[PDB]
Design a binder for this molecule. Structure first.
Ligand SMILES: Cc1cc2nc3c(=O)[nH]c(=O)nc-3n(C[C@H](O)[C@H](O)[C@H](O)COP(=O)(O)OP(=O)(O)OC[C@H]3O[C@@H](n4cnc5c(N)ncnc54)[C@H](O)[C@@H]3O)c2cc1C
Ligand SMILES: Cc1cc2nc3c(=O)[nH]c(=O)nc-3n(C[C@H](O)[C@H](O)[C@H](O)COP(=O)(O)OP(=O)(O)OC[C@H]3O[C@@H](n4cnc5c(N)ncnc54)[C@H](O)[C@@H]3O)c2cc1C
Ligand SMILES: Nc1c2ccccc2[nH+]c2ccccc12
Ligand SMILES: Nc1c2ccccc2[nH+]c2ccccc12
Ligand SMILES: [Zn+2]
Ligand SMILES: [Zn+2]
Lengths: 228, 230
């Protein structure tokens, strides 16, 4: 009985991200997993980190510090319900898949806000309690990314540099920081110019991999797997 | 000559914050020099971070299947992007220097500002095909990240826990700013104001004030895959 959370950030159901998300739902479910989906755009998820994220009264009214206030709110069960809803989903998940098109070598703002607001201190990490000692230890995480740029453009000698440059902030900076074990990202390069067959090739590749997903080795997340 | 233009894209909730202070020092110094300074205070504007179909005000080209990149590109051409987007582009178009002032969130920009990049820097406006990197459409403009961090300077080196700072900079400076044709000036990184001594804080403010005095004469950094990981 494995739980899976797919955090999904595309505006369009009939999109290539959309298909990757659907396949993952279908395949994983077929194996007896419980798959929950956070369809950020459909939820019209709030990306701004504001004082409205605390329901209670503020630890300090005159000066607002988002980090400090959300920390306190987490422990005191005073965070806004949309945040706590996500946290619950994350908490129960054995695996968290992030499904998104690359925007500016990163996640779309709506998914960046989910990270900013959901992964708060006390919940995803603490001091001490980060990187290997992070609070979400024991959970698995996979980035499923699509790109406009082709694979060659994402090499050490392409116009974009190596892909591990855009993976760093998310995989090390964010996921490893919270204690996740990061599986190899799934990157579908340039589906928009790919052919019908290659697109299906790509969707098929994702489907296949998901079959044996729970047997995979977490990548060694360090400053040697991304720039060397 | 009185009046030459800076846009500060500001991403912090609190006026009395350290970021707030850095923003006011820039406004004050650049104004003292006789520059026009415009500030997009994103949180006060309640700026919309989400890339959605509400960003286009015409009839969609393909209503049955929404493609954000395609639709905004065409909207840009029809001059029918949302006014919030179009207002930001006006500010970018007129500026000679764009400063982004923000606290580091998850080795990157706060979502509200990520939304600004997503929505404001659309195809046809900031880049095209051809017309990116060296031929980016915002060529002839200066850009500067002014970032505050939770981590200490030592924490952001090769041997520190967060790795070299150049890794979190790469996506912003090369992937976004260079891609758009900006000339990128070296980042101002103010490390850990929250836990630094009152003395270290004032120096960080003074150091920023001082750099701004000759900011226009500064040489852009070499935007190279060797500038971040070599
Ligand atoms: C603001 C912004 C910033 C961006 N920044 C970057 C960047 O920094 N780097 C970069 O490389 N790119 C960037 N891009 C481009 C972006 O990443 C790609 O456009 C995106 O990943 C495409 O994914 P998609 O789901 O939208 O593809 P889609 O447009 O949905 O897919 C294209 C085609 O695949 C078809 N398809 C769907 N399902 C199947 C199926 N199962 N099998 C057969 N075909 C199928 C669709 O019908 C469609 O015709 C950016 C885009 C925007 C809008
Ligand atoms: C969701 C989230 C994610 C984060 N991710 C990261 C990350 O990936 N990496 C990382 O390193 N950090 C991270 N942080 C920490 C964050 O970057 C820092 O908290 C932030 O940069 C501090 O800047 P500030 O303006 O908010 O500080 P403030 O708390 O506003 O300032 C600290 C002190 O400076 C004082 N001050 C203001 N003006 C002056 C003045 N003119 N002269 C003297 N003192 C003054 C204030 O009074 C205050 O006491 C994250 C925080 C959050 C909430
Ligand atoms: N901002 C970008 C795009 C926006 C709309 C459509 C395609 C895009 N491709 C990109 C490729 C590399 C960097 C930025 C890109
Ligand atoms: N991911 C981080 C944070 C997330 C939420 C609140 C505060 C944070 N401080 C950090 C300081 C250093 C590195 C990562 C940090
Ligand atoms: Zn790591
Ligand atoms: Zn570059």
């Amino acid at each position: 009985g494995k739980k899976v959370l797919i955090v999904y950030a595309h505006q369009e159901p009939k999109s290539f991200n959309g298909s990757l998300k659907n396949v993952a739902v279908d395949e994983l479910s077929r194996q007896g997993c419980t798959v929950t989906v956070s369809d950020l755009y459909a939820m019209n998820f709030e990306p701004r980190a504001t004082d409205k994220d605390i329901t209670g009264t503020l630890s300090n009214p005159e000066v607002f510090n988002y980090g400090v206030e959300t920390h306190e709110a987490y422990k005191q069960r005073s965070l806004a319900s949309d945040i706590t809803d996500e946290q619950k989903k994350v908490r129960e998940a054995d695996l968290v898949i992030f499904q998104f098109p690359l925007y500016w070598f990163s996640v779309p703002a709506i998914l960046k806000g989910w990270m900013d607001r959901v992964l708060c201190q006390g919940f995803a990490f603490d001091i001490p309690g980060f990187y290997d000692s992070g609070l979400l230890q024991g959970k698995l995480a996979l980035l499923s990314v699509t790109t406009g740029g082709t694979a060659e453009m994402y090499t050490k000698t392409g116009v974009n540099g190596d892909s591990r440059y855009f993976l760093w902030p998310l995989q090390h900076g964010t996921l490893h920081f919270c204690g996740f074990k990061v599986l190899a990202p799934q990157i579908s390069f340039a589906p928009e110019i790919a052919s019908e067959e290659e697109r299906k090739g790509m969707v098929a590749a994702w489907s296949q991999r998901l079959q044996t997903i729970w047997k995979e080795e977490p990548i060694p997340c360090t400053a040697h797997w991304h720039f060397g």
